[PDB]
Design a protein around this ligand. Structure first.
Ligand SMILES: [Ca+2]
Ligand SMILES: [Ca+2]
Ligand SMILES: [Cl-]
Length: 265
């Protein structure tokens, strides 16, 4: 456990027995549903950390079940904030097996929950506790932006490492264009700047130290994508945590963590 994930190196995928290593990469297909895949994976790793089986959440249920005006669920992505609202409104997260994903079904009518379906949110609670001496906590999520940490990136890194260790992952936002280069196939540590904005949710799942092609000691994030297991390096990639020195923007735009109460299994 600790030898696979500590403050200097964390790669749970190298422990074939780890619950988290048994959460296989998924393929969102040709809809903008990464917000669902990354958010649900964060709950899946939290469940693993609390001793539950690596059972997948139905992304399709979350895509299709919502209150209010009709939405454009294939063409337009939403946010981790909305993901939590759907949980609050419905109280039920079916398993993938009960309502499995096909991107062509994103937007269809929300299905009836059948009697035999599993609720992977049973005894879960999103926390809205008001603990800090300010009115801004208790939203159910906490978000950090690399631009706000531009003069203190060591603290941004430490926050993410702590959450990866404790929750198994964080949600991270990137600009999808940035991983579209031919070079993102393969096993090298990528090194590049981000943009002013982001549009695609992924997960940071680990990290480590390495030496770059210029002989400099550096560090990388291990990032999970939702473009299937033939994209990148078996569905994941490594990216330099700091990137080129000239960058105005970090490759990681922002991270989100969910604040939930879930009893140990
Ligand atoms: Ca760019
Ligand atoms: Ca910006
Ligand atoms: Cl749509």
């Amino acid at each position: 456990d600790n030898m696979f994930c500590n403050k200097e190196y964390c790669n749970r995928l190298k422990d074939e027995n780890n619950c988290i290593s048994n959460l296989q990469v998924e393929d969102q297909g040709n809809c903008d549903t990464s917000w669902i895949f990354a958010s649900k994976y964060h709950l899946e790793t939290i469940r693993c950390m609390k001793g539950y089986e690596p059972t997948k959440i139905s992304a399709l249920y979350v895509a299709n079940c919502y209150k209010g005006e009709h939405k454009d669920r294939c063409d337009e992505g939403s946010s981790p904030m909305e993901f939590l609202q759907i949980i609050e409104d419905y109280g039920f997260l079916p398993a993938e097996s009960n309502y499995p994903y096909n991107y062509v079904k994103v937007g269809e009518q929300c299905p009836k929950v059948e009697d035999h379906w599993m609720n992977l949110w049973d005894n879960g609670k999103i926390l809205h506790n008001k603990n800090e001496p300010n009115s801004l906590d208790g939203k159910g999520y906490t978000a950090y932006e690399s631009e706000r940490f531009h003069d203190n990136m060591d603290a941004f890194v430490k926050i993410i490492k702590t959450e990866v260790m404790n929750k198994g992952s964080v949600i991270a936002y990137i600009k999808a264009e940035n991983v579209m280069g031919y070079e993102f196939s393969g096993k090298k540590v990528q090194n590049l700047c981000g943009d002013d904005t982001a549009d695609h949710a992924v997960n940071i799942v680990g990290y480590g130290n390495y030496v770059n092609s210029e002989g400099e000691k550096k560090s990388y994030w291990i990032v999970r994508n939702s473009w299937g297991p033939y994209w990148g390096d078996e569905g994941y990639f490594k990216v330099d945590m700091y990137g080129p020195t000239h960058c105005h923007f970090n490759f990681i735009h922002s991270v989100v963590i969910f604040n939930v109460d879930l009893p140990m299994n």
